[PDB]
Amino acid sequence: QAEIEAERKRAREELRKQVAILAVAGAEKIIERSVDEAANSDIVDKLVAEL
Amino acid sequence: LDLAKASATDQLKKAKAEAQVIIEQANKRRSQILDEAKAEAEQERTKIVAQA
């Protein structure tokens, strides 16, 4: 039972790498659905600059 | 008297030793049975907490 733990930890760590990696996409789709639910008009000019 | 008590004696003690042996047969018999049981159990356990 002891061993598997450390590996699982590494897995979550990669989830952190890909997590920060995902931060990008979250900024992207972030502004995206921002315009969608804006549902009034979309000015992408304003830069939220979300991470 | 001699004939009777003699036969009874011999058959008696012979029967005795036989019995003792039998007890031994059952002894390490079922006992060994116990040991093997111990082993198998061990396997199952390692499996279980591994699964954990």
Swiss-Prot record, chain B:
It is found in: Cell inner membrane. Signal peptide: none annotated. F(1)F(0) ATP synthase produces ATP from ADP in the presence of a proton or sodium gradient. F-type ATPases consist of two structural domains, F(1) containing the extramembraneous catalytic core and F(0) containing the membrane proton channel, linked together by a central stalk and a peripheral stalk. During catalysis, ATP synthesis in the catalytic domain of F(1) is coupled via a rotary mechanism of the central stalk subunits to proton translocation. Belongs to the ATPase B chain family. F-type ATPases have 2 components, F(1) - the catalytic core - and F(0) - the membrane proton channel. F(1) has five subunits: alpha(3), beta(3), gamma(1), delta(1), epsilon(1). F(0) has three main subunits: a(1), b(2) and c(10-14). The alpha and beta chains form an alternating ring which encloses part of the gamma chain. F(1) is attached to F(0) by a central stalk formed by the gamma and epsilon chains, while a peripheral stalk is formed by the delta and b chains. This is ATP synthase subunit b. The chain holds residues 54 to 105 of 156 of the full protein.
